[PDB]
Amino acid sequence: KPLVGTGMERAVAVDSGVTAVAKRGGVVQYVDASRIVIKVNEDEMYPGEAGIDIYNLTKYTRSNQNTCINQMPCVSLGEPVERGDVLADGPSTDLGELALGQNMRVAFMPWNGYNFEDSILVSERVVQEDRFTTIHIQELACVSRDTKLGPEEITADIPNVGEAALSKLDESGIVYIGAEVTGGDILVGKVTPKGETQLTPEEKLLRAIFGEKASDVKDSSLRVPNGVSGTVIDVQVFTRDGVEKDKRA
Amino acid sequence: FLKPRLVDIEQVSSTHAKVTLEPLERGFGHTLGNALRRILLSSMPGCAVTEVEIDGVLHEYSTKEGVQEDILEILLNLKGLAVRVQGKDEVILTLNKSGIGPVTAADITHDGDVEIVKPQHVICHLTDENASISMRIKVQRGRGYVPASTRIHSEEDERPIGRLLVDACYSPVERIAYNVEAARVEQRTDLDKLVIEMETNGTIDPEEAIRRAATILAEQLEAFVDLE
Amino acid sequence: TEFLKPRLVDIEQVSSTHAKVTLEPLERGFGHTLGNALRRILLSSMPGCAVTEVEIDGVLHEYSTKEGVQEDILEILLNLKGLAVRVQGKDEVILTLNKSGIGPVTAADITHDGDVEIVKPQHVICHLTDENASISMRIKVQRGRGYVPASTRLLVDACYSPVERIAYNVEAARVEQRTDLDKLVIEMETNGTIDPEEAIRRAATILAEQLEAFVDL
Amino acid sequence: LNTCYRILGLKPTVIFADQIMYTGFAYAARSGASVGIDDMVIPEKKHEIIS
Amino acid sequence: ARVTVQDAVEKIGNRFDLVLVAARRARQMQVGGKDPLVPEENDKTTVIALREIEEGLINNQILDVRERQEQQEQEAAEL
Amino acid sequence: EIKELLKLGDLPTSGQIRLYDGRTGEQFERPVTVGYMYMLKLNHLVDDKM
Amino acid sequence: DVVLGLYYMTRDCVNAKGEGMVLTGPKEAERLYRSGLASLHARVKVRITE
Amino acid sequence: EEAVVWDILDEVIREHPVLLNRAPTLHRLGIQAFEPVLIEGKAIQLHPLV
User: Fold this and answer.
1) Are C128 and C68 in contact (CB under 8 A)?
2) Which subunits sit against E, judged by 3+ Cβ pairs under 8 A?
3) Where are any strands of DSSP class E within C47-123?
4) Any coiled-coil ranges, and where (chain D)?
């Protein structure tokens, strides 16, 4: 929360759908990091079927800016809750207030020109407590599409690869959920057909010496962008109508 | 050429403590207290969590049916779990606890070589009638700050994908300050006494702190020493 | 747990009254630990020995005049502070000056006592003009551990500190894969009572004789 | 620095500038050299001078 | 870590002919055709050339003499 | 109002204190304005710019 | 920052701790400053080889 | 990223100047050559005097 605000935070944390307000008043029937069942009050319910307010929070969705949006509860089991009270907090929301940044203990003083022009000098304690460790969610998908030499294949049988890489794929060459990877690793093993190569004679001599035949297929292989390393949290598969699904599908 | 020794050792709170040394020459206080507080706030034995695994939790970005806390928020508190191991080096604990009610930090099985310093700490709030968890904490000793981002290079091949890593922080010390005053003594006109007010975490006792600190300090003089 | 121990990576000295030493590798912060500690030691607590109090026989005033000396009183007074005295095994030796010759007065026109060594013989304490200028003052020297001004003590500022200037700088340290380590670099000048090398060793020894009440192994 | 350049040459002026920078930053840091609300001195004559 | 070439320019002060000559010499030492004339204190050919310029033992004229010698050297191996 | 909020919180009136250097140990002369502030981590991470 | 540090050093007030005295030169003046016995803005007159 | 290649890179950088440019290039000084200094992280260090 902002240690020094203007009160106008609630006016923006409740307006943005990032929050989750309570419609009907009651007492919390069940809290969880997935759903929140609110037992509506007898004096504040419809005279038929009586319902309840069963809320469903969002969990770790990729924002338009590749950042992370997620809602977390703020009330424990069995607690009185009126209407207009934040049943759960989302990204940059602290119990109803707009949590834009963080509270940093600043001290105006030069320090060996380490700040010289406008540069900022931060303590090691800050980067230790993970108070600025913002989470991001990239969305990189593979597309097996028909080509001039036949349709591509999403098989884990990739040529010119190692056994240490294909160890993080399934029987269909699709990265295991949760398995942490880094840039250069394979997430979707795909190969595109490519015939009529006609290598140079010097290579043909190699193919005759060590008996290393050349595959008629190229490599597609949706691989993690170099520079960023993360964890797989969702894997979706959309197969065209007609074409029978694979195992992972 | 007076040689100081500890005189006052009173630890007011479990974490907050104080120590003191009188026998100092002209302004030797500053020179000692600053160069000592540095070695304290940087290098200290400590122990902390490094490896954590839960029943079917594959990644920190997930939710378990029954826990009102998020897995990320669980490890976020696991970093605040103070412990102390002596005999072994790396120890695998075992935490099993079910039923509604906040999970105390002592809900873990007691091993032969372990001792908690604050079981009142919170790990995760259970809210379901039949919510049960099974985890095995992996605690070990170290020094300084070690984040999990650079931890995965020594390679060790963690085969179970269900193994999650937590940011390590081996830091017995929390905060330290020093002060100097003019205190009369037996055979001297005017000198200075040095008081060191520190903030531990409950893991390391305040004695070994200054002891091993001065030890490591002296070790850096090996460039010009043999045996005094 | 173990640690990282330094080893003198290089050493250099332009002269005997000045030298530079470099100790690497180091540990984060430690480059300032040792630097600050040894620096304070070789500034405000170090034995040496030197001039403390002086009086003239011609006139008794730090602002008066003299008949025969083209110099000013406080001038010779300061030159006294700039005198490298090394007493062997005695505490305080009050020596006297006795010179009346036509020309400058070096540090060899004094009364050599039992054990009083001057490492700056050609040192100029005064300039003497013509005819005679019979001048014979009585200088007093003392021991001490550090620097003590003349006002908080003719009055003279006693400079017992065997060093004239200390300095240290921390920089990067390339250790095979270690990201950011320290490399201590000391640049120290003396006055003559002792050479740099041994004096650095002496201050660093005072440190160990201070912390000797704690060690395991 | 300009007189240094056209007195001693290029080679000296360079090292002079580098040294000036290092020393500056160090001293400007340890001098405190900050700013607070009380630093701004509102002239107590303001009220009158305004009206 | 050659920082300033002031003295290196002083020998040929043109600021460009310096680069041309030093490049010819740096080639001689890099694209194997010759050996260094100064103790190679791990210095790259780029810097060693400038150092040879500084000492005054290498320039356009001297290299033009050496190459002219090797011109007849290459013709004294064909009977 | 702030001056009084400070006196209530066992804090100075000028909002300035003394600061001690971690390395050297001596205090920076000439008081130093310290305290808290709200810092914003703009979406300009170098890990995406470089 | 650079000009500020230099200007701060090259200042003088009138009553700095130990002003008006004399010293051999820069070595001793720094021995006075760092020790904490003398100030930095004293009007002290000393000897210097130019 | 084998360990030996870091020392190899330090051997190739040694006296191998590089060029730094600021986005609007008004005068010729907008592009200046510096001597590489290998550093950790992702930020480019620049000399304040320039």
Assistant:
1) yes
2) D, H
3) 50-55, 85-86, 105-106, 117-118
4) none
